[PDB]
């Protein structure tokens, strides 16, 4: 059960915020800031597993993240999700943005936020892991782009 997907750069400016628990907008913002301060303070050689804060439902949840370039990709999961399972999910996610965006960068996360939500939905659905076969995932998003092209 993925609580929420938080994506932000090294400066804490949000790039994605998709929640699977009913939280208010102010609560979402302070959550984003809390995870950013918890994660960015650690250097590159630190592990990617932080105990969850009080704003995401308590310590029962955990903050799992990966760093690419200057972007942070943090998944809020409880004690029931696999640490490296979620890590590999993040890896497939970022590679999905790389080839769906033709070498994605922060700028694509800024100007193409809706397509990134689409990528997340095709990968994870309401806190459930939907698709992990990368090739079929990109094929389905490309087909969706085909129906946008056709109509």
């Amino acid at each position: 059960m993925i609580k929420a997907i938080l994506i932000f750069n090294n400066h804490g400016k949000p790039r994605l915020s998709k929640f699977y628990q009913p939280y208010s907008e102010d609560t979402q913002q302070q959550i984003i800031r809390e995870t950013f301060h918890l994660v960015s303070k650690r250097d590159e050689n630190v592990c990617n597993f932080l105990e969850g804060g009080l704003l995401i439902g308590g310590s029962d949840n955990k903050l799992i993240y990966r760093h690419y370039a200057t972007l942070y990709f943090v998944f809020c999961v409880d004690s029931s999700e696999s640490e490296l399972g979620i890590l590999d999910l993040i890896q497939v996610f970022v590679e999905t943005l790389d080839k769906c965006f033709e070498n994605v960068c922060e700028l694509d996360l800024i100007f193409h936020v809706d397509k990134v939500h689409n990528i997340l939905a095709e990968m994870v659905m309401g806190g459930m892991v939907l698709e992990t076969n990368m090739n079929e995932i990109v094929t389905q998003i490309d087909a969706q782009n085909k129906l946008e092209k056709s109509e």
Partner: protein, 570 residues
């Protein structure tokens, strides 16, 4: 980011170096990326050169071996036509701690010190700083370089040159002995930080090379005078510390105007200034007497700033103003600042000791103050009266009886000990409440603080020596309780105290004296301000602030009996 720098695009390199500088400011490890940065140190873009040299300055001591691989590039950079590049290259060379770089560094420093640009000259002074920190065995030629540098007329170099002289050769006084005139004349035009350093060194030099107030000794004072109005706190404090340690006592009081003026500045500036003025006021009280009101505590200042102001007020207390201060102390006692409220309670007792004529009046402020509902105020008020009650071992019944009733509601360990201690000394003056006090504490001994426990054995023995007819069982109760206590200090006292008191079977000559030693009149404490210890330290220095001889303290000497030859110094 490695491939990003390996790109031929200079803008890409610039962006990568800016990101690397950013993550350095974050404090992360960029030593792995050194092989990419060292490649473009010879780039033709000035901005990329500056960022690259910042990276090299930061990580030259981390990846020392790759820097060793590229020493010749730094050698070539030493001849760069732009001054900042020469300074940076010499800096990077100085950053290398390999025991082999030495002679190259020596030649680098020689060339830099001979080169015309003043900026690289002060950087070369810092270079001899670094080399002396690296290879102490080169100090002869380092001192030669310093002698060459000190002759330079530029002030920008002069400040750093004086610092390099001082940390490399503090004892070779003769180099500054030669250009006393040049330094004193430039001290008007030297930049403020250089002014502070030069003034400290000149104060030490005048303390060493002159006798009691010589035209040259006045020459220092003559030209240091205009700096007392300077806007820099360090400059004025340096001048003020100069006057205190050099000027005649009839003229050195002039600084009290500027030193007080600094108290209008920020918190940190006046924390040191209040610390210095506190020490100055002890030895020479009359200079800060006219500014007594300027040391009155304002509620806006923090605890540490206000507490120092209190200590200055104590040292300035006199029979002509003790009454004014005593009234002001009563105002500060009931302040919402509990930490400060404790300090003012301490201040009254210190002023009571200094002004012996108002001992009773100071008590009247405190004995009535003992009824305050504040747990911390009563904690220190009983402590301070204890000192005052100890000082006059008179039968002050109107005071001691009040504490004994209060003791049941006192929780602070030091205060509980003070009450038990006063009861122990005055057991015969209060023979009716003292026995009950021990009975109260004996039940609660196991929960008392370790400090408080000690006084109960002291109380238990003292009551035994005078009124053993009925407190003999109470004394044996409390001694047995302390015998099994966890802290070995109490087990040490109980072993000693029981031995002195109980075993009349082995009652030798020393044991019959036991009632004399415990009940011996206690001499008044020579309470000392926590600023008299600063009499051994120079004002305005770090060691004065910490009251400890800091690493690299430049100790002042005593005034010499006879002045060294003035004719040499011309």
């Amino acid at each position: 980011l490695k491939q990003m720098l390996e790109s031929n695009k200079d803008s890409a390199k610039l962006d990568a170096m800016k990101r690397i500088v950013g993550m350095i400011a974050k404090g992360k490890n960029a030593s792995e990326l050194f092989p990419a940065v060292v490649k473009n140190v010879a780039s033709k873009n000035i901005e990329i050169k500056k960022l690259v040299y910042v990276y090299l300055v930061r990580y030259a001591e981390e990846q020392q071996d790759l820097a060793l691989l590229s020493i010749s590039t730094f050698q070539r950079a030493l001849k760069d036509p732009n001054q900042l590049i020469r300074a940076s290259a010499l800096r990077v060379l100085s950053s290398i701690r390999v025991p082999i770089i030495v002679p190259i560094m020596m030649l680098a420093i020689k060339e830099a010190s001979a080169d015309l640009s003043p900026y690289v000259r002060k950087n070369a002074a810092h270079a001899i700083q670094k080399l002396y920190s690296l290879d102490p065995e080169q100090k002869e030629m380092l001192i030669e370089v310093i002698e060459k540098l000190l002759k330079d007329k530029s002030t920008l170099v002069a400040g750093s040159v004086v610092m390099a002289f001082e940390e490399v050769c503090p004892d070779r006084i003769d180099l500054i002995h030669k250009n006393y005139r040049k330094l004193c004349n430039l001290l008007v035009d030297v930049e403020e930080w250089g002014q502070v350093v030069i003034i400290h060194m000149l104060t030490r030099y005048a303390r060493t090379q002159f006798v009691s107030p010589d035209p040259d000794h006045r020459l220092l004072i003559r030209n240091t005078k205009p700096l007392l109005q300077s806007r820099n706190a360090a400059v004025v404090m340096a001048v003020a510390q100069l006057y205190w340690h050099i000027s005649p006592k009839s003229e050195a009081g002039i600084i009290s105007k500027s030193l007080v003026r600094l108290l209008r500045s920020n918190r940190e500036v006046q924390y040191i200034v209040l610390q210095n003025i506190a020490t100055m006021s002890i030895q020479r009280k009359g200079m800060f007497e006219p500014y007594l009101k300027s040391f009155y505590v304002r509620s806006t200042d923090p605890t540490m700033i206000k507490t120092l102001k209190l200590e200055i007020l104590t040292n300035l207390a006199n029979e002509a103003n003790i009454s004014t201060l005593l009234r002001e102390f009563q105002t500060y006692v009931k302040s919402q600042d509990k930490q400060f409220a404790a300090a003012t309670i301490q201040t009254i007792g210190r002023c009571a000791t200094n002004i012996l004529e108002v001992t009773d009046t100071c008590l009247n402020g405190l004995v009535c103050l003992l009824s305050n509902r504040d747990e911390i105020v009563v904690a220190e008020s009983v402590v301070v009266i204890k000192k005052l009650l100890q000082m006059q071992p008179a039968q002050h019944g109107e005071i001691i009886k009040h504490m004994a009733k209060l003791l049941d509601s006192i929780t602070v360990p030091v205060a509980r000990a003070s009450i038990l201690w006063l009861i122990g000394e005055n057991c015969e003056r209060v023979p009716k409440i003292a026995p009950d006090v021990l009975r109260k504490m004996a039940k609660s001994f196991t929960s008392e603080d370790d400090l408080v426990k000690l006084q109960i054995l002291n109380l238990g023995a003292k009551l035994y020596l005078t009124n053993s007819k009925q407190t003999k069982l109470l004394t044996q109760y409390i001694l047995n309780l302390g015998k099994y206590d966890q802290n070995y200090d109490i087990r040490d006292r109980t072993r000693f105290i029981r031995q002195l008191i109980v075993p009349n079977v082995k009652s030798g000559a020393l044991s019959k004296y036991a009632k004399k030693i415990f009940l011996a009149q206690k001499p008044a404490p020579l309470l000392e301000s926590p600023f008299k210890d600063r009499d051994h330290f120079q004002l305005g220095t770090l060691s004065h602030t910490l009251n400890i001889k800091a690493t690299g303290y430049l100790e002042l000497s005593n005034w010499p009996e006879v002045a060294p030859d003035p004719s040499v110094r011309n």
